Amino acid sequence: EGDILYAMYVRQTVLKVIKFLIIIAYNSALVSKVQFTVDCNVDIQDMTGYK
Amino acid sequence: AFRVLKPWWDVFTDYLSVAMLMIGVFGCTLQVMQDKIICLPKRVEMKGLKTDLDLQQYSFINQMCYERALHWYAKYFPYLVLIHTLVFMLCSNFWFKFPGSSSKIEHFISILGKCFDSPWTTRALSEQAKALFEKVKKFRLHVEEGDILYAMYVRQTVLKVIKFLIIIAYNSALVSKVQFTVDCNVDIQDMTGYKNFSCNHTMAHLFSKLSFCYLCFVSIYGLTCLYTLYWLFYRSLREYSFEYVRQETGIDDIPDVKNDFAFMLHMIDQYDPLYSKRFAVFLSEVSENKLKQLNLNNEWTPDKLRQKLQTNAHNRLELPLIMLSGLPDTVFEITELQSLKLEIIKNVMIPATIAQLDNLQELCLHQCSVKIHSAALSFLKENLKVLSVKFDDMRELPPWMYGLRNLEELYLVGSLSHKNVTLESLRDLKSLKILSIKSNVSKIPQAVVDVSSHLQKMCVHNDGTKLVMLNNLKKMTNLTELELVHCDLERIPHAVFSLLSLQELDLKENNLKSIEEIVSFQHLRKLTVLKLWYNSIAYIPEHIKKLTSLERLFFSHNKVEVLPSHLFLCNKIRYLDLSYNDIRFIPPEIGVLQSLQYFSITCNKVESLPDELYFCKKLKTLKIGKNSLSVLSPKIGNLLFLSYLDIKGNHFEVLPPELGDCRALKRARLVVEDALFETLPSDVREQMKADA
């Protein structure tokens, strides 16, 4: 008289699939974002004299 | 005890509390480790901007602006979160950490686990749980008077809700307060030469992000409470009605539960739907009755019942029952018993298994409230012949006994008047032949008139109640034997004169003084037996000579001093009871009583015995008893048929050897003094005791 456990397992599997899909989708684009070197221009002039 | 008390929302709240505690500890660790404020003076090809300030001044400025500019909530956020999480954990765990309700919780857990563990629950649905029913009822009586635990839990939930509301309300505004960069203008000029400073601390952005996620957790936490709060205020968990166990298992017991009990039942059902079903069984009283029945079946075996089988008073195989809680089924296995005896056995139900006991005709009941089955009642109607019932306050009297047509003899031991006797009509008793009543009947009930068409023997022996109304006794035409013991009439009633079929008459303890009604007894020519026990009779009327049918005479324990000669005119009398009277001399006319076989004058003042007394050669029972006889006549040797002699308590000096002529009288039937027996010759005493 159960069968709810099967639905629970299906929901868990679906959640895992969705999480993996989102992970791949955004990590693929975000990995290329990072760089070793970087440049920053902030209003540190008149604070340290450089920007 | 530690696991079955957690509903799903409670588990989620516990997990959220653990996560928030971890967040607070992590925040405190990072605040101790890396939370440092860096400050610089604010207002000033681009070259360097040396401030010619030493490290000590830098540290001083960092401390100063950290105390000044940085927001108090921003600095206290880790400790704040830690404190809130600790308070939530404390208010969650105080439910079980409070011993006053913890004792009740532990007792409930133990009893529920034990009841679920018992396989007898499943057996009843389809051993030592019998004593566990006592703990079950103890708990149900003790803890239904509580409901304070429900209020405690409600207060804890309310406190959690209020804390969550306050947390959201102030954190929502306070989160936006924090900033990564900051400015402070303190009076450090003329101390460090600067006033305006721009500063920042590392954790800010991270803290911001962290705080955001923290808020989300709290939000869910609050939502959880709401659901529970709604579940607290939508179902009204103070009362729980099963309405399913009763419908399925078909048990009308276990009606409802109190506030505390319904609360705990709801909590367990939400934790597990089947634990409540398994635990509800021991609340049932019918289940307790059946478990006691099983325990009795284990206790009782047919061997024990057959051991207790014996012979009753009225020559039947009887199984006396003296203290039982019901009817063991093994009793129905033993059909050889003809009588059954019950003593002080309440709440008895007789099933159709009584039909197994075919050879049953007598039943004895002593203070037993018993009900029958339809098949049981029919079997009793068609098979029983004798019935004995003892009841004290009429509550043990089964009404269906008035419907037994084939009953022949009935015995009643219990007051009926408590004036009229509380007796139902005896119409269905179509075969009643002998009736015995031990009650306080003052006027004869009409019910007996409904049975007189075939009634032959009616006995009423009251404990002193006067039979004031004798109207119905005249209706006992078919009555052949009548006994009225202690009916306190003080005279011979006129009703007995209306019974021509009477044969034996008893008037024990009727205190008769004037017995001049013997002439009325002349209308009865079948009066073979007449009894006058325990009366104040001092004179024997001459009319007693006219009772031709007299065969037995009883006058023991009366005021008779001088017995008339004409008393011996009834030559057909075989039993003559004259003991415990004031008799001093026996008239010689007793010699004409040749048919006499019994004579007892014990505890009288008899001083001499006439020789004609020895002429009654048919005398087989001579009870002289304690009298004033000083010598024994040799003529006693003539009574070759004499079987019993009782002369103890007299003034005898030497017993004549003629006592050896009594063949039927032995030493066992000889009641004499030791010296009197020893005065006999050796041959006589040897022949009396043995065959030499």
Swiss-Prot record, chain A:
It comes from the Eukaryota. The chain crosses the membrane at residues 10-31. It is found in: Cell membrane; Endoplasmic reticulum membrane. Disruption phenotype: Mice do not show remarkable changes in body weight or the weight of white adipose tissue on a chow diet, but display significantly lower body weights and fat mass than wild-type mice when fed a high-fat diet. Moreover, improved insulin resistance induced by the high-fat diet is observed. Expressed at very low levels in adipose tissue. Residues 32-51 are extracellular. Induction: Induced during the earliest stages of adipogenesis. The volume-regulated anion channel (VRAC) channel forms a trimer of dimers, with symmetry mismatch between the pore-forming domain and the cytosolic LRR repeats, a topology similar to gap junction proteins. The cytoplasmic N-terminus preceding the first transmembrane (residues 1-22) regulates volume-regulated anion channel (VRAC) conductance, ion permeability and inactivation gating. Heterohexamer; oligomerizes with other LRRC8 proteins (LRRC8A, LRRC8B, LRRC8D and/or LRRC8E) to form a heterohexamer. Homoheptamer; inactive, likely because it is not targeted to the plasma membrane in the absence of LRRC8A. In vivo, the subunit composition may depend primarily on expression levels, and heterooligomeric channels containing various proportions of the different LRRC8 proteins may coexist. Belongs to the LRRC8 family. Non-essential component of the volume-regulated anion channel (VRAC, also named VSOAC channel), an anion channel required to maintain a constant cell volume in response to extracellular or intracellular osmotic changes. The VRAC channel conducts iodide better than chloride and can also conduct organic osmolytes like taurine. Plays a redundant role in the efflux of amino acids, such as aspartate and glutamate, in response to osmotic stress. This is Volume-regulated anion channel subunit LRRC8C. The chain holds residues 254 to 304 of 803 of the full protein.
